[PDB]
Amino acid sequence: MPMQMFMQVYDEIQMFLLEELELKFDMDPNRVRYLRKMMDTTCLGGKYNRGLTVIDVAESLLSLSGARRKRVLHDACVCGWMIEFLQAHYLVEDDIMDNHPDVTVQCAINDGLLLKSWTHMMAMHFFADRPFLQDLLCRFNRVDYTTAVGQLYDVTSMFDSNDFAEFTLSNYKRIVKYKTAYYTYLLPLVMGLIVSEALPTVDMGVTEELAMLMGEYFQVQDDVMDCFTPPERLGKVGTDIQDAKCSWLAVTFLAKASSAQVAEFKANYGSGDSEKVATVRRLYEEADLQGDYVAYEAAVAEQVKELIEKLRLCSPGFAASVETLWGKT
Amino acid sequence: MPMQMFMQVYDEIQMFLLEELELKFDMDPNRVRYLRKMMDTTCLGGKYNRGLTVIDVAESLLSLSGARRKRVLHDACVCGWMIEFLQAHYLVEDDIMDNHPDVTVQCAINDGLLLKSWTHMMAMHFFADRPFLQDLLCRFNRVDYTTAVGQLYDVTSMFDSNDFAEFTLSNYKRIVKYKTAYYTYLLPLVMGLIVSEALPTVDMGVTEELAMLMGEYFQVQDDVMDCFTPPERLGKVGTDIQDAKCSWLAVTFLAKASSAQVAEFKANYGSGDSEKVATVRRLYEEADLQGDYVAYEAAVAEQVKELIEKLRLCSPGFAASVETLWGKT
Ligand SMILES: CSc1ncccc1C(=O)N(C)C
Ligand SMILES: CSc1ncccc1C(=O)N(C)C
């Protein structure tokens, strides 16, 4: 039912957007079909955890506060696709960064703009008569801004914006929080509260704290898998070492490395050479980082498992969806 | 006074945005100064015609409907900078299209996202208590969407989105209308009406028609200058022929060329070779396109000079600013 309903609303949203282009923006059929394929390629095929989380928050709140049921759930589905389209937008922007005018790059830039604009167009249409439309747009735009700021923190973590000084745990958490947690964990919860009209009924402090912690938990595991999970099992080629990323492994290693090891880490980090990357993996191994990884996640899990309880003391139904969200993590 | 006030509000807007980053987004000084320089580099130095047009529309309407004066004019200045920041955003995106992770491209993509997000942040702050905030955001987002659609029309005018068939005058006007006229001509007028509270008092049909015509007038001259005005006088190297652009010259030539000339045009268009570009300029000359250019602009000017009168029959003060805007064109 959840996934089936999410996909039906995708067809409805897509058909509105494409007909709007045909009927109001003078678009020719060849380009409409081109954009339908681009939308399908970039928005479909993931796990939809961000979008389905909006649905789950919405259904948990209509069970603990007929016609309002159907409207809120449909609104939850449109909000889920807003976040999924926003995610598709970030992925396209990421692909440009590592990919006679080159029309494929021109079309990639254009795709990224269209995907973001479509979040606005689908909200303005489907929520035109909702009282929360203005607050919805503002919180959505603020989270999107936050994500772009987090991307700046991430991309410049090894230089001086006109260098391992910013390789600290607090900066690592700043990157995770702004670059990932806000739009991936906080935003689905907030939107589920907005369409459920129950926004001012929750402790947003605990809610923000949980979203940040859950993003941190997921990103630490992601960082360790990027380095140790082999590509055919990870689903991609891990490249954090080559890319000099401010990863959990890097910042944890630098806190417990010896002076000559840090020299060896610094001499080998951020290189595509197979032996230097292997040297970094070797250093991580010797420092027992995969052992510290288990303890770190355990401590985070304890903070999460205990923070949902504060939340449920005044917002019981909200906590069950946050628990399901955390369970997926 | 107009330019002086526009620049003072720039400092106010910039200081709000940078302090917000420092105070609410955990940004370090090095990055704040980096973003201040980027903002200055990308947003300042133009002619500010889009932004000042908002101011001019606002002052013309408070003279023909003390405290409301100062508030509306300040709102007009924030709106002007919204459009100027949006323009800076499009220019950055354009530069990426024709410009080991490459951090300059990463930072260019990031700049483009920040510049767009800043239009939302400055609106949400300075208009937080305005009744028009929701309508303002929606019309702004719709024009931005329109511009991205026009960019798609422009970039794909020579191919089949998975070719001179789309080299027609009606498609040329579709490109100009969506890619330029809406955000450059229509949007400043609309925003000036919104902050002046006089939006539902104007004939939006005539207003849209004027904005489209004025964009067309300006783009036709731009197209002819791109081909014939030498670089040190044009301010850039004209490259429409090399880039196979659907320009006014191209579509006008194809309507009056002979079969063997179209073969010669088709064989030489869209090439960087100096002789093929010169062959295209030669063909344009022989067809007396610079003579037809004068007549075309004259006819457009007549439609403009006569459409402002319909506008002033019910919206007199609005027409004087539209006249000043047209005068700049
Ligand atoms: C638990 S996985 C998840 N849960 C909620 C939203 C998004 C995700 C996700 O797919 N990533 C990669 C974080
Ligand atoms: C008349 S020039 C102008 N007027 C109003 C808004 C923008 C402009 C402009 O600079 N271009 C390049 C169109």
XYZ file of C-alpha atoms and ligand atoms in Angstrom:
684
model
C 0.000 0.000 0.000
C 2.653 2.656 0.905
C 4.932 2.061 -2.080
C 1.952 1.420 -4.355
C 0.372 4.741 -3.359
C 3.686 6.605 -3.634
C 4.127 5.386 -7.209
C 0.557 6.205 -8.257
C 1.056 9.799 -7.125
C 4.310 9.897 -9.095
C 2.312 9.235 -12.262
C -0.195 11.913 -11.256
C 2.538 14.457 -10.483
C 4.486 13.654 -13.649
C 1.366 13.912 -15.803
C 0.485 17.289 -14.299
C 4.001 18.628 -14.843
C 4.251 17.372 -18.426
C 0.760 18.535 -19.392
C 1.493 21.925 -17.821
C 4.556 22.191 -20.068
C 2.507 21.169 -23.103
C -0.473 23.398 -22.295
C 1.081 26.444 -20.588
C 4.749 26.505 -21.683
C 4.393 25.755 -25.427
C 6.464 22.565 -25.221
C 6.561 20.276 -28.249
C 5.910 16.509 -27.926
C 9.515 15.505 -28.677
C 10.699 17.571 -25.713
C 7.852 16.429 -23.438
C 8.827 12.799 -24.015
C 12.481 13.766 -23.538
C 11.666 15.301 -20.148
C 9.465 12.350 -19.150
C 12.429 10.033 -19.732
C 14.814 12.367 -17.882
C 12.416 12.609 -14.934
C 12.060 8.820 -14.784
C 15.826 8.305 -15.072
C 16.746 10.736 -12.307
C 13.838 10.391 -9.860
C 13.036 6.659 -9.951
C 15.077 3.626 -8.962
C 16.230 4.535 -5.457
C 14.770 3.236 -2.227
C 12.460 6.259 -1.665
C 13.205 6.267 2.073
C 12.950 10.067 2.253
C 9.612 10.111 0.444
C 8.054 7.129 2.197
C 9.076 8.616 5.555
C 6.664 11.498 4.904
C 3.883 8.971 4.297
C 4.745 7.047 7.466
C 4.774 10.167 9.648
C 1.416 11.160 8.150
C -0.272 7.814 8.802
C 1.026 7.651 12.380
C -0.515 11.039 13.168
C -3.979 10.448 11.712
C -4.149 7.469 14.097
C -3.409 9.603 17.183
C -3.997 13.359 16.880
C -12.321 9.905 6.185
C -12.019 12.961 3.955
C -9.147 14.472 5.941
C -7.476 11.053 5.788
C -7.391 10.899 1.988
C -6.291 14.532 1.651
C -3.466 14.343 4.203
C -2.096 11.106 2.737
C -2.142 12.517 -0.800
C -0.394 15.646 0.494
C 2.177 13.389 2.156
C 2.838 11.713 -1.196
C 3.374 15.026 -3.000
C 5.754 16.097 -0.223
C 7.628 12.815 -0.509
C 8.139 13.409 -4.216
C 9.294 16.965 -3.507
C 12.140 15.528 -1.416
C 12.815 12.789 -3.978
C 12.947 15.382 -6.766
C 15.246 17.509 -4.592
C 17.467 14.451 -4.103
C 17.458 13.826 -7.865
C 18.487 17.474 -8.272
C 21.486 17.106 -5.926
C 22.595 13.907 -7.675
C 22.565 15.615 -11.081
C 24.603 18.493 -9.655
C 27.035 15.955 -8.180
C 27.405 14.227 -11.557
C 28.333 17.505 -13.266
C 31.134 18.058 -10.736
C 32.974 14.872 -11.767
C 31.790 14.338 -15.360
C 32.116 23.948 -29.411
C 29.374 23.857 -26.763
C 28.974 20.485 -25.043
C 25.226 19.893 -25.186
C 25.363 16.981 -22.728
C 26.769 19.274 -20.029
C 24.313 21.975 -21.103
C 21.474 19.475 -20.767
C 22.827 18.221 -17.430
C 22.853 21.736 -15.986
C 19.357 22.271 -17.404
C 18.144 18.995 -15.850
C 19.374 20.111 -12.440
C 17.453 23.384 -12.687
C 14.284 21.684 -13.921
C 14.363 19.107 -11.122
C 14.568 21.794 -8.440
C 11.918 23.955 -10.134
C 9.604 20.940 -10.325
C 9.551 20.757 -6.507
C 8.114 24.281 -6.492
C 5.683 23.653 -9.361
C 4.241 20.481 -7.833
C 3.863 22.175 -4.433
C 2.224 25.302 -5.861
C -0.262 23.167 -7.811
C -1.226 20.453 -5.333
C -1.143 22.727 -2.260
C -2.555 25.883 -3.893
C -5.485 25.844 -1.427
C -3.581 24.743 1.640
C -2.973 27.098 4.589
C 0.529 25.656 5.100
C 1.760 26.360 1.553
C 3.773 29.427 2.569
C 5.355 27.766 5.602
C 5.979 24.645 3.513
C 7.887 26.555 0.831
C 9.956 28.482 3.384
C 11.054 25.442 5.397
C 11.787 23.558 2.164
C 13.825 26.455 0.769
C 15.692 26.809 4.061
C 16.663 23.127 4.125
C 17.782 23.292 0.494
C 19.928 26.314 1.385
C 21.322 24.389 4.357
C 22.281 21.516 2.047
C 24.164 23.849 -0.307
C 26.036 25.281 2.669
C 26.921 21.759 3.793
C 28.184 20.990 0.301
C 30.484 24.012 0.583
C 31.809 22.721 3.921
C 32.407 19.294 2.375
C 34.060 20.367 -0.886
C 36.451 22.827 0.802
C 37.378 20.701 3.824
C 40.967 20.222 2.569
C 41.852 23.772 1.450
C 41.591 27.447 2.429
C 38.647 28.988 0.556
C 40.167 31.983 -1.242
C 45.062 21.059 4.836
C 44.034 18.865 7.764
C 43.259 21.632 10.272
C 39.525 21.152 9.669
C 39.825 17.352 10.009
C 38.093 17.294 13.384
C 35.091 15.418 14.721
C 33.072 18.584 15.313
C 33.659 19.742 11.735
C 32.901 16.242 10.465
C 29.544 16.494 12.230
C 28.995 19.984 10.820
C 29.429 18.568 7.317
C 27.111 15.606 7.931
C 24.486 17.792 9.608
C 24.258 20.427 6.876
C 25.120 18.332 3.818
C 22.921 15.313 4.578
C 20.979 15.097 7.842
C 18.734 18.137 7.351
C 17.221 17.176 3.990
C 17.504 13.396 4.409
C 16.282 12.958 8.004
C 14.843 16.225 9.347
C 12.959 17.352 6.230
C 10.788 14.204 5.771
C 9.741 14.390 9.429
C 8.908 18.101 9.240
C 6.888 17.744 6.030
C 4.967 14.814 7.492
C 4.126 17.071 10.437
C 3.112 19.960 8.170
C 0.616 18.035 6.036
C -0.649 16.404 9.247
C -1.169 19.912 10.725
C 0.707 18.741 13.852
C 3.848 20.862 13.411
C 3.599 23.022 16.588
C 2.808 19.964 18.736
C 6.292 18.389 18.785
C 9.568 19.184 20.523
C 11.535 20.380 17.497
C 14.727 20.475 19.565
C 14.668 16.745 20.269
C 13.475 16.177 16.699
C 16.407 18.102 15.216
C 18.773 16.335 17.609
C 17.476 12.930 16.495
C 17.720 13.788 12.792
C 21.335 14.925 13.222
C 22.268 11.833 15.234
C 20.647 9.466 12.734
C 22.415 11.155 9.827
C 25.695 10.867 11.721
C 25.076 7.168 12.431
C 24.313 6.479 8.770
C 27.235 8.543 7.458
C 29.814 6.885 9.732
C 28.768 3.462 8.455
C 28.793 4.872 4.920
C 32.344 6.158 5.436
C 33.630 2.818 6.727
C 31.930 0.857 3.930
C 33.348 3.276 1.352
C 36.856 2.239 2.427
C 36.438 -1.475 3.209
C 33.363 -2.845 1.415
C 34.521 -4.085 -2.015
C 32.922 -2.385 -5.035
C 30.717 -5.249 -6.241
C 29.228 -5.424 -2.726
C 29.143 -1.683 -1.975
C 27.473 -0.804 -5.280
C 30.156 1.706 -6.297
C 33.894 2.291 -6.258
C 34.815 3.871 -2.937
C 36.917 6.963 -3.499
C 37.039 8.970 -0.242
C 40.782 8.414 0.242
C 41.586 9.493 -3.327
C 39.276 12.497 -2.935
C 40.808 13.610 0.399
C 37.389 13.539 2.043
C 36.913 14.635 5.649
C 35.647 11.170 6.535
C 35.003 9.631 9.931
C 37.986 7.323 9.388
C 40.324 10.214 8.575
C 39.421 12.348 11.596
C 39.390 9.363 13.971
C 42.782 8.208 12.697
C 44.406 11.613 13.171
C 43.373 11.706 16.832
C 45.141 8.416 17.653
C 48.047 8.357 15.169
C 51.699 8.817 16.056
C 53.724 11.712 14.669
C 55.491 9.592 12.043
C 52.176 7.932 11.132
C 50.483 11.301 10.561
C 53.439 12.143 8.333
C 52.782 8.868 6.503
C 49.038 9.554 6.359
C 49.596 13.116 5.144
C 52.087 11.930 2.526
C 49.650 9.330 1.136
C 46.180 10.887 1.505
C 44.356 12.396 -1.450
C 46.204 10.440 -4.150
C 44.881 8.159 -6.862
C 47.965 5.936 -6.694
C 46.955 2.392 -5.763
C 49.795 1.945 -3.269
C 49.143 5.219 -1.436
C 45.446 4.357 -1.075
C 46.484 0.907 0.151
C 48.857 2.581 2.612
C 45.931 4.601 3.975
C 43.813 1.455 4.343
C 46.765 -0.198 6.092
C 47.085 2.700 8.542
C 43.340 2.574 9.258
C 43.590 -1.175 9.929
C 46.547 -0.884 12.311
C 44.680 1.765 14.318
C 41.740 -0.645 14.833
C 39.288 1.831 13.335
C 36.754 -0.863 12.450
C 36.774 -1.794 16.135
C 36.244 1.805 17.220
C 33.519 2.081 14.569
C 31.372 -0.496 16.384
C 31.661 1.335 19.707
C 30.972 4.750 18.153
C 27.788 3.546 16.448
C 26.719 1.776 19.646
C 27.041 4.999 21.645
C 25.145 6.915 18.952
C 22.452 4.232 18.902
C 22.089 4.636 22.669
C 21.601 8.394 22.301
C 19.024 7.756 19.562
C 17.251 4.931 21.408
C 16.974 7.245 24.430
C 16.037 10.469 22.616
C 12.877 9.026 21.043
C 11.499 8.618 24.570
C 11.653 12.341 25.337
C 9.829 12.800 22.032
C 7.023 10.343 22.822
C 6.277 11.912 26.225
C 4.418 14.721 24.421
C 4.276 13.397 20.815
C 3.535 9.651 20.976
C 2.438 8.956 17.402
C 5.347 10.957 15.994
C 7.824 8.737 17.853
C 6.631 5.496 16.241
C 7.424 6.846 12.772
C 10.771 8.190 14.003
C 11.408 4.698 15.377
C 10.584 3.126 12.006
C 12.840 5.704 10.338
C 15.641 4.893 12.790
C 15.012 1.180 12.287
C 15.687 1.610 8.567
C 19.031 3.165 9.557
C 19.128 58.624 -5.413
C 17.893 55.425 -7.188
C 21.310 53.838 -7.701
C 22.534 55.152 -4.348
C 19.568 53.573 -2.552
C 19.888 50.316 -4.509
C 23.521 49.976 -3.434
C 22.837 50.785 0.225
C 20.274 47.982 0.360
C 22.830 45.659 -1.237
C 25.091 46.220 1.769
C 22.150 45.628 4.108
C 21.102 42.439 2.300
C 24.667 41.131 2.082
C 25.297 41.826 5.763
C 22.112 40.006 6.757
C 22.977 36.989 4.610
C 26.574 36.773 5.831
C 25.677 37.290 9.492
C 22.935 34.670 9.154
C 25.570 32.221 7.903
C 27.889 33.140 10.772
C 25.186 33.087 13.453
C 22.765 30.373 12.278
C 24.763 28.142 9.894
C 28.046 27.771 11.841
C 30.132 29.369 9.083
C 33.753 30.234 9.828
C 35.183 33.703 9.028
C 37.420 32.469 6.192
C 34.363 31.121 4.377
C 32.213 34.176 5.170
C 34.808 36.440 3.556
C 35.080 33.970 0.668
C 31.322 34.185 0.086
C 31.313 37.983 0.445
C 33.873 38.184 -2.365
C 31.954 35.672 -4.501
C 28.707 37.592 -3.983
C 30.379 40.876 -4.941
C 32.048 39.311 -7.990
C 28.885 37.738 -9.378
C 26.177 40.234 -8.377
C 27.877 43.622 -8.837
C 29.242 45.351 -11.917
C 26.321 45.118 -14.336
C 23.914 47.899 -15.192
C 21.219 46.792 -12.682
C 18.436 47.565 -15.168
C 16.300 44.680 -13.880
C 16.692 45.764 -10.263
C 16.291 49.497 -10.813
C 13.158 48.819 -12.875
C 11.479 47.504 -9.712
C 12.369 50.754 -7.944
C 11.051 52.852 -10.834
C 7.735 50.992 -10.997
C 7.392 51.416 -7.227
C 8.021 55.168 -7.228
C 5.625 55.752 -10.133
C 2.805 54.033 -8.243
C 3.192 55.803 -4.897
C 2.715 59.030 -6.885
C -0.614 57.887 -8.382
C -2.442 55.056 -6.596
C 5.312 58.729 4.449
C 5.667 55.422 6.276
C 4.204 53.370 3.425
C 6.569 55.244 1.100
C 9.736 54.152 2.904
C 8.524 50.562 3.309
C 7.446 50.082 -0.316
C 10.684 51.554 -1.678
C 12.810 49.347 0.581
C 10.741 46.341 -0.516
C 11.340 47.384 -4.124
C 15.091 47.371 -3.481
C 15.047 43.869 -1.979
C 13.014 42.665 -4.969
C 15.481 44.284 -7.348
C 18.330 42.404 -5.704
C 16.332 39.171 -5.896
C 16.259 39.545 -9.689
C 19.912 40.627 -9.784
C 20.896 37.606 -7.681
C 18.793 35.404 -9.976
C 20.632 36.909 -12.957
C 23.974 36.256 -11.243
C 22.791 32.668 -10.739
C 22.022 32.181 -14.456
C 25.387 33.667 -15.453
C 27.264 31.251 -13.181
C 25.305 28.343 -14.656
C 26.153 29.625 -18.144
C 29.858 29.793 -17.270
C 29.878 26.151 -16.143
C 28.436 25.077 -19.508
C 31.444 26.408 -21.453
C 34.238 26.324 -18.849
C 40.833 14.064 -9.047
C 37.888 16.333 -8.203
C 38.072 19.788 -9.790
C 37.313 22.106 -6.880
C 36.839 25.148 -9.131
C 33.950 23.421 -10.920
C 32.690 22.143 -7.564
C 32.789 25.694 -6.217
C 31.152 27.056 -9.381
C 28.230 24.650 -9.046
C 28.011 25.538 -5.347
C 28.026 29.273 -6.166
C 25.101 28.805 -8.536
C 23.054 27.053 -5.853
C 23.913 29.637 -3.199
C 22.977 32.542 -5.472
C 19.529 31.098 -6.163
C 18.979 30.162 -2.505
C 19.926 33.701 -1.474
C 16.923 35.054 -3.417
C 14.690 32.936 -1.179
C 16.559 33.778 2.036
C 16.470 37.537 1.448
C 12.761 37.408 0.557
C 11.828 35.266 3.565
C 13.695 37.638 5.895
C 12.761 41.079 4.582
C 9.167 40.149 3.665
C 8.455 37.807 6.602
C 5.572 40.073 7.706
C 4.248 40.951 4.282
C 0.877 39.654 3.029
C 2.286 39.215 -0.497
C 5.176 36.934 0.520
C 3.444 33.758 -0.669
C 2.329 35.240 -3.989
C 5.777 36.803 -4.399
C 7.575 33.474 -3.993
C 5.195 31.665 -6.356
C 5.444 34.189 -9.196
C 9.227 34.343 -8.734
C 9.532 30.549 -8.778
C 7.285 30.342 -11.836
C 9.387 32.846 -13.788
C 12.581 31.030 -12.805
C 11.014 27.786 -14.051
C 10.023 29.556 -17.271
C 13.628 30.681 -17.763
C 14.942 27.124 -17.371
C 12.409 25.945 -19.942
C 13.550 28.691 -22.309
C 17.146 27.600 -21.801
C 16.118 24.090 -22.864
C 14.491 25.497 -26.017
C 17.647 27.486 -26.776
C 20.253 24.782 -26.129
C 18.403 22.115 -28.149
C 17.326 24.298 -31.080
C 19.700 22.493 -33.485
C 19.094 18.837 -32.538
C 16.376 16.303 -31.688
C 16.191 15.960 -27.893
C 16.609 12.222 -27.286
C 18.733 20.459 -37.672
C 17.155 23.651 -39.001
C 13.500 22.580 -38.789
C 13.060 24.659 -35.623
C 14.790 27.682 -37.210
C 11.558 29.641 -37.537
C 10.485 33.078 -36.372
C 7.785 31.718 -34.067
C 10.269 29.384 -32.375
C 12.816 32.200 -32.202
C 10.217 34.228 -30.310
C 9.427 31.251 -28.079
C 13.098 31.095 -27.096
C 13.367 34.841 -26.452
C 10.097 34.914 -24.509
C 10.901 32.057 -22.132
C 14.689 32.371 -21.929
C 14.907 36.149 -21.472
C 11.777 38.308 -21.623
C 9.943 36.830 -18.627
C 12.662 37.329 -16.007
C 14.314 40.368 -17.613
C 11.254 42.446 -18.579
C 8.080 40.946 -17.089
C 9.436 40.021 -13.648
C 10.709 43.513 -12.638
C 7.340 45.018 -13.586
C 5.367 42.381 -11.673
C 7.502 42.695 -8.534
C 7.195 46.478 -8.629
C 3.425 45.987 -8.742
C 3.482 43.464 -5.887
C 5.389 45.614 -3.392
C 3.226 48.558 -4.498
C 0.109 46.444 -3.742
C -1.236 47.411 -7.196
C -0.965 43.984 -8.850
C -4.689 43.344 -9.587
C -5.131 46.875 -10.979
C -3.289 46.411 -14.298
C -4.065 44.658 -17.570
C -1.612 41.770 -17.259
C -2.328 40.726 -20.846
C -1.039 43.985 -22.305
C 1.751 43.941 -19.716
C 2.895 40.455 -20.735
C 2.594 41.432 -24.396
C 4.797 44.489 -23.839
C 7.428 42.531 -21.900
C 7.639 39.928 -24.681
C 7.865 42.577 -27.403
C 10.562 44.531 -25.564
C 12.608 41.382 -24.999
C 12.253 40.550 -28.688
C 13.346 44.067 -29.690
C 16.405 43.877 -27.438
C 17.338 40.337 -28.494
C 17.145 41.080 -32.232
C 19.567 43.976 -31.801
C 21.716 41.734 -29.600
C 21.764 39.070 -32.325
C 22.805 41.519 -35.045
C 25.513 43.094 -32.867
C 26.818 39.632 -31.961
C 27.570 39.037 -35.652
C 28.675 42.488 -36.856
C 29.850 44.586 -33.894
C 33.599 43.947 -33.478
C 34.678 42.445 -30.138
C 36.401 45.495 -28.636
C 33.190 47.469 -29.266
C 30.677 44.724 -28.422
C 32.377 43.832 -25.135
C 32.774 40.143 -26.009
C 33.617 37.803 -28.861
C 30.434 37.090 -30.793
C 29.990 33.363 -31.249
C 26.394 32.687 -32.373
C 27.454 31.403 -35.805
C 30.039 29.026 -34.317
C 27.491 27.883 -31.727
C 24.724 27.243 -34.302
C 22.365 29.526 -32.399
C 18.759 29.994 -33.499
C 19.391 33.701 -33.996
C 17.227 36.316 -35.668
C 19.758 36.513 -38.510
C 19.690 32.752 -39.091
C 15.901 32.415 -39.230
C 15.477 35.574 -41.326
C 18.145 34.409 -43.773
C 16.559 30.989 -44.270
C 13.239 32.563 -45.259
C 14.784 34.584 -48.114
C 17.724 32.404 -49.219
C 17.920 30.470 -52.469
C 18.215 26.687 -52.506
C 21.950 26.701 -53.258
C 22.482 29.425 -50.639
C 20.719 27.380 -47.946
C 23.016 24.526 -48.943
C 25.932 26.936 -48.499
C 24.532 28.220 -45.197
C 23.896 24.689 -43.935
C 27.380 23.586 -44.986
C 29.046 26.481 -43.122
C 26.881 27.083 -40.030
C 27.934 25.869 -36.602
C 31.670 25.686 -37.332
C 34.589 27.356 -35.599
C 36.535 27.652 -38.855
C 37.251 31.309 -39.606
C 36.354 31.012 -43.293
C 33.027 29.262 -42.683
C 32.013 31.928 -40.151
C 33.084 34.570 -42.672
C 31.001 32.786 -45.311
C 27.972 33.046 -43.018
C 28.595 36.765 -42.468
C 28.940 37.155 -46.241
C 25.608 35.411 -46.842
C 23.923 37.616 -44.225
C 25.345 40.724 -45.922
C 24.204 39.738 -49.418
C 20.671 39.157 -48.110
C 20.548 42.741 -46.745
C 19.744 41.511 -43.248
C 21.019 44.687 -41.590
C 18.523 46.566 -43.755
C 15.675 44.261 -42.766
C 16.820 44.590 -39.145
C 15.981 48.311 -39.127
C 12.474 47.712 -40.473
C 11.794 44.821 -38.079
C 12.778 46.868 -35.023
C 10.756 49.822 -36.323
C 7.625 47.674 -36.598
C 8.239 46.249 -33.119
C 8.786 49.754 -31.750
C 5.434 50.773 -33.235
C 3.689 47.870 -31.497
C 5.412 48.836 -28.234
C 4.789 52.578 -28.609
C 1.104 51.781 -29.198
C 0.652 49.089 -26.532
C 1.658 51.358 -23.635
C -1.411 53.468 -24.433
C -3.853 50.621 -23.796
C -1.990 50.147 -20.514
C -2.269 53.786 -19.410
C -6.033 53.944 -20.043
C -6.572 52.054 -16.767
C -3.045 52.081 -15.239
C -1.524 55.529 -15.880
C 1.364 55.538 -13.405
C 2.402 52.025 -14.420
C 2.794 53.146 -18.041
C 5.349 55.865 -17.265
C 7.714 53.306 -15.736
C 7.093 50.918 -18.640
C 7.940 53.842 -20.925
C 11.190 54.484 -19.043
C 11.943 50.754 -19.223
C 11.251 50.758 -22.970
C 13.326 53.917 -23.354
C 16.319 52.082 -21.887
C 15.785 49.451 -24.601
C 17.701 4.512 6.710
S 18.148 4.772 4.969
C 17.300 6.310 4.734
N 16.292 6.623 5.574
C 15.605 7.776 5.454
C 15.922 8.689 4.449
C 16.959 8.385 3.569
C 17.662 7.187 3.708
C 18.787 6.868 2.749
O 18.493 6.193 1.776
N 20.044 7.353 2.933
C 21.105 7.035 1.976
C 20.300 8.155 4.129
C 16.986 48.153 -21.676
S 18.398 47.182 -21.076
C 17.550 46.293 -19.799
N 16.400 46.806 -19.314
C 15.702 46.183 -18.345
C 16.152 44.977 -17.810
C 17.339 44.429 -18.296
C 18.049 45.086 -19.302
C 19.334 44.482 -19.823
O 20.365 44.875 -19.303
N 19.334 43.516 -20.779
C 20.598 42.944 -21.249
C 18.048 43.108 -21.342
